[PDB]
């Protein structure tokens, strides 16, 4: 029982990690666009 | 022993994940505010 709960927890945590990676990539693109905008201005 | 260490590791990792989510949310709000500022300017 303890083992299956741990496996399920890691599975869900990997989904969480994947969402945080998505977020970070979005933010990186957006800050880069702002930096370039200001440079181009 | 191996099992309790793994459970404790996941527990701590979930705390880490929660901190990264906090950070990403903060950053998203801040970049959005900057984007809107520049648009309003």
């Amino acid at each position: 029982q303890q083992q299956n709960n741990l496996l399920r927890a890691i599975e869900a945590q990997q989904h969480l990690l994947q969402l945080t990676v998505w977020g970070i990539k979005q933010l990186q693109a957006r800050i880069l666009a702002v930096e370039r905008y200001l440079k181009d201005q | 022993q191996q099992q309790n260490n793994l459970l404790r590791a996941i527990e701590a990792q979930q705390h880490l994940l929660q901190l990264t989510v906090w950070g990403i949310k903060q950053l998203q709000a801040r970049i959005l505010a900057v984007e809107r500022y520049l648009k309003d300017q």
Partner: peptide, 27 residues
């Protein structure tokens, strides 16, 4: 994917993990 959906899914997975970890605290 949107930020509103991002927040929803984050919350879903977090609550599931909490339940799983607790349910294991009761080894």
């Amino acid at each position: 994917m949107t930020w509103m959906e991002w927040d929803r899914e984050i919350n879903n997975y977090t609550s599931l993990i909490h339940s799983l970890i607790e349910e294991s605290q009761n080894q």
